[PDB]
Design an enzyme around this catalytic site. Structure first.
Site, short mmCIF file in Angstrom:
data_model
loop_
_atom_site.label_atom_id
_atom_site.label_comp_id
_atom_site.label_asym_id
_atom_site.label_seq_id
_atom_site.Cartn_x
_atom_site.Cartn_y
_atom_site.Cartn_z
N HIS A 22 0.86 -1.17 0.00
CA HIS A 22 0.00 0.00 0.00
C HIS A 22 0.90 1.23 0.00
O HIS A 22 2.07 1.14 0.38
CB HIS A 22 -0.85 -0.06 1.28
CG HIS A 22 -1.88 1.02 1.39
ND1 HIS A 22 -1.58 2.30 1.79
CD2 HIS A 22 -3.23 0.99 1.20
CE1 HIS A 22 -2.69 3.03 1.81
NE2 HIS A 22 -3.70 2.25 1.47
N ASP B 77 -11.07 1.77 -1.47
CA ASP B 77 -10.17 2.67 -0.73
C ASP B 77 -10.97 3.49 0.29
O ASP B 77 -10.70 4.68 0.49
CB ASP B 77 -9.38 3.59 -1.67
CG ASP B 77 -7.95 3.83 -1.19
OD1 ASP B 77 -7.62 3.41 -0.06
OD2 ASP B 77 -7.17 4.44 -1.97
MN LIG Z 1 -5.56 3.02 0.54
#
Ligand SMILES: [Mn+2]
Ligand SMILES: [Mn+2]
Lengths: 335, 335
Positions: free
Chosen positions: B174, B297
């Site tokens: 990430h 997200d």
């Molecule tokens: Mn993220």
């Protein structure tokens, strides 16, 4: 029948070659010193490159003829005159531009030229930009990403962009190696160069220009980016989506347009070094067909595969003509 | 009846929050301190964020229900436990992983989870990775790009990747803010974050991993990149083309495969923060439909537009099912 105008074709001239030879012996810490030593240094790792860069009417022209390439739009190869001090850079930019105009006039049906400048001295650069446009009548401008490890959002460079906008010449922002702001992560695995560093360096420059509002200040500017737009076309949705957070929480300035709107309005791209039909089609879809130009990136890329890439592109013939040469002829004032 | 599994869904837990509140007051110069102060600082610019990150069964599950989202694959939010000292990071990783396991076990049809670790101490991280795989039976792993301003080509981290490969768990890399090697260029216009810095930091990490030969050493690693592969899918042709120069002149090691071949063999990507059908189509074309996964997200992005993005994608139903949830079920061991 397809008119092919390659838009990112490097050249060099003896006075610049001699200056880089001398510069290669200095203790400059810039990451371009890797390339500079390899090509211009004593005992160079790539001894044939100066010859291939300098050649215009020998191997270069024969290769154009063999592959049916109509023109090269020539540019002083990276890092141009930007590594020298202001005085030397300024002197050499004049010399290089005069030699560029001379090279073009020897065979103007086959070559067009971009002038360069030494933004180490923005006032003198602005004067040279005017001279290139009006006195030499060259086709546009080229600069190699950063100068003095600063990006083109910096107000230091405003007199340059003011002059570019007034001139009507498009500016090709060619790569050079990552600046000292970022070079630390590009010292390994040959990443200083075209494989990764060039793209990160150049795209970051362009993004800073957009987000700083340079294109609200100079809205008639036209910027050209090679290497399929240094991947900025791929990031457009995220650039747009995240812009609200950047102005709200991040202290970025308010822009009249969205980031991707500046990209479509003020930028065009070339396919140098990205001979991918999939990426070409993507870019045509999101930028529109008027915004994509073909290039070879000679002598760093061979001509034949670049040519066959565009001749075999799975797009309509009228769009192919635009990409192959029509857009370049418009953007770089080529008849 | 399209099964939707969101693969990059951030969450946090009280012990990590408390640790980051304290860290916010230190004089760490990491570029992540901008985010850390904003969310976890004593005077937070983003005061609701901790609540949204912490919530699993309240607003988050309610939004999942309203939008027909079957699952979130949860990950401790960036910067995870990587900003702490080795001992503290190691302690909090275990605690965060235990809480993640318990959170998943409480609603295992709606939540899957990735465990994290503290690479500050590779030996300890290796043990925690084994615990995560064998004892907690979590769905995979997450780490936020750099640790201590080093990238994962560094042999220092070899015990970590040895453990990951053996565990059979996929590692989601990430983003985090640009490391100190590159952060100088990302201090302006909000570029430290998702708008630009995140992608440059994370993609550079992955490119170093590939070019260093990490995937010849650990050929069974599976790495996942969000944000449409941090644009790596767009650069594949140029990565491959220039790799010859990198090994010949640049001191890059000789690899068994081409860079894009490692990317397809060892990586998969997600669509987090890139709700572009054009970018989605490009990615499916160059990576294959088995290597692209949907994500939201959340809570940095809202669920509804991300859901409608995949539900309306101009791809066949069987390919849409793979992207929406099928690939994630395979890659992250979800029934
Ligand atoms: Mn993220
Ligand atoms: Mn070039």
């Amino acid at each position: 029948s397809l008119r092919l105008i390659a838009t990112e074709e490097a050249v060099t001239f003896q006075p610049v070659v001699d200056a880089l030879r001398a510069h290669s012996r200095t203790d400059d810490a810039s990451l371009d010193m890797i390339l500079v030593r390899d090509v211009y240094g004593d005992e160079p790792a790539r001894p044939a490159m100066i010859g291939r860069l300098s050649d215009v009417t020998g191997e270069r022209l024969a290769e154009m003829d063999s592959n049916g390439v109509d023109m090269h739009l020539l540019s002083l190869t990276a890092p141009g005159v930007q590594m020298f001090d202001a005085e030397t850079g300024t002197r050499l930019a004049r010399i290089a531009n005069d030699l560029m105009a001379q090279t073009v006039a020897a065979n103007p049906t086959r070559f067009a030229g971009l002038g360069t400048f030494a933004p180490q001295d923005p006032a003198s650069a602005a004067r040279e930009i005017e001279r290139v446009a009006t006195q030499l009548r060259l086709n546009g401008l080229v600069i190699n990403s950063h100068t003095n490890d600063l990006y083109y959002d910096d107000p230091f460079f405003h007199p340059v962009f003011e002059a570019i906008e007034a001139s009507g010449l498009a500016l090709y922002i060619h790569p050079r190696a990552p600046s000292k702001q970022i070079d630390r992560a590009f010292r390994d695995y040959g990443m200083n160069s075209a494989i990764w560093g060039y793209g990160i360096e150049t795209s970051t420059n362009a993004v800073r220009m957009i987000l700083s509002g340079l294109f609200d200040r100079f809205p008639r500017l036209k910027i050209v980016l090679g290497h399929m737009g240094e991947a900025i076309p791929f990031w457009l949705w995220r650039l747009d989506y995240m812009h609200g957070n950047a102005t709200t929480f991040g202290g970025a300035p308010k822009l009249k347009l969205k980031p991707s709107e500046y990209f479509r309005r003020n930028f065009a791209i070339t396919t140098s070094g990205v001979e991918s039909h999939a990426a070409l089609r993507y870019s045509i879809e999101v930028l529109g067909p008027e915004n994509v130009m073909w290039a070879i990136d000679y002598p760093y890329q061979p001509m034949a595969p670049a040519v066959q890439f565009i001749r075999t592109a799975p797009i309509p013939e009228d769009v192919k003509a635009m990409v192959a040469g029509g857009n370049a002829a418009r953007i770089f004032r080529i008849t």
